[PDB]
Design a protein around this ligand. Structure first.
Ligand SMILES: CC(C)(C)c1ccc(N2C(=O)c3cc(F)ccc3[C@H](CC(=O)O)[C@H]2c2ccc3c(c2)OCCO3)cc1Cl
Ligand SMILES: CC(C)(C)c1ccc(N2C(=O)c3cc(F)ccc3[C@H](CC(=O)O)[C@H]2c2ccc3c(c2)OCCO3)cc1Cl
Ligand SMILES: [Ca+2]
Ligand SMILES: [Ca+2]
Lengths: 164, 169
């Protein structure tokens, strides 16, 4: 099961290191860099987990209601989320980039990995990641996993989690 | 088994992309960017796979007989290898950095991952990675995996000697 190792790496080699000082980085942005009125960036890292493992080049080509806003200071990006043609939220948003391995494996004949195998691994990755973060010290209330399957709205998917 | 996913990621996300173009990068370097009165860099990517999963940050401090030379142009580094205090070879050398996950996990109480669990996973990583590269198109004659278990006795192993043995083959 390839997902097991991907989810551990994602956590241990990345989340474990960026999550402890994430809220301070958002706090600096809100207080000193934010030129947006009433639009404060949310306190959590929103992680996009598409079950089809399709990670685009840039986030905005996937949805026109997701617009790049700034780089989070001190590798992370801030986006504005549109609802009804208006800014409905602002957050630090990204893809769980280890999903690229599952998509690349499904695209390599010698891996013997079908689309059905990919979907199962994608789901397994999400569940293993949920279990790791649940027992993780630095991941108490600063991380949000947005798992989804696909006119679909990626912005409406993020906004529901933001409202939570 | 954490190793299965690490080995696939290492290959599909990295090796598959750098190996096809590697020999041309070394050729250009040797012809246009290398110092005249010095050794030509070897044509393969030498990958260090320590079974204890200890990746050293700065490779030049793991062994004093391994000295940084230059960056390969167009993320890869060139090193000189010393034998008896003299330059015995030059190559593009690196660690299989996904091994860092196995070491970090062994250092995290909540992972329930022992040293014995880590050794088994490093073994499976090497085993999987070898099988992948064996059937892989882009791995022509441009990649060598250097797997090594450091023996209890410090006097019976040298990292530079380990690399030079592969370089000579
Ligand atoms: C489709 C392309 C563009 C080829 C791609 C992109 C990224 C990745 N990566 C991963 O999937 C990956 C997987 C992990 F479990 C941990 C970290 C990464 C990282 C995640 C990241 O960089 O955001 C990465 C990866 C995969 C293999 C590597 C590596 C990095 O760095 C050098 C060693 O091998 C893989 C592919 Cl197939
Ligand atoms: C000990 C420290 C320093 C904390 C460490 C260092 C590297 C890594 N990485 C990996 O182990 C890793 C594992 C993979 F399967 C593929 C690619 C990577 C890459 C390999 C590389 O960068 O050379 C990486 C990794 C691991 C998780 C990631 C990521 C990158 O990029 C962003 C997404 O999550 C992990 C740790 Cl624990
Ligand atoms: Ca010893
Ligand atoms: Ca010693």
């Amino acid at each position: 099961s390839v997902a097991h190792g991907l989810a551990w790496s994602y956590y241990i080699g990345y989340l474990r290191l960026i999550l402890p000082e994430l809220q301070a980085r958002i706090r600096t942005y809100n207080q000193h860099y934010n030129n947006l009125l009433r639009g404060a960036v949310s306190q959590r890292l929103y992680i996009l987990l598409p079950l089809d493992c399709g990670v685009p080049d840039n986030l905005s080509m996937a949805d026109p209601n997701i617009r790049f806003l700034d780089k989070l200071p001190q590798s992370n990006s801030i986006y504005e989320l549109l609802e009804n043609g208006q800014r409905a939220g602002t957050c630090v948003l990204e893809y769980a980039t280890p999903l690229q391995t599952l998509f690349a494996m499904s695209q390599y004949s010698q891996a013997g990995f079908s689309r059905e195998d990919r979907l199962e691994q994608a789901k397994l990755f999400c569940q293993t990641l949920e279990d790791i973060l649940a027992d993780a010290p630095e991941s108490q209330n600063n991380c949000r996993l947005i798992a989804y399957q696909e006119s679909f709205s990626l912005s409406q998917e993020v906004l529901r989690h933001l409202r939570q």
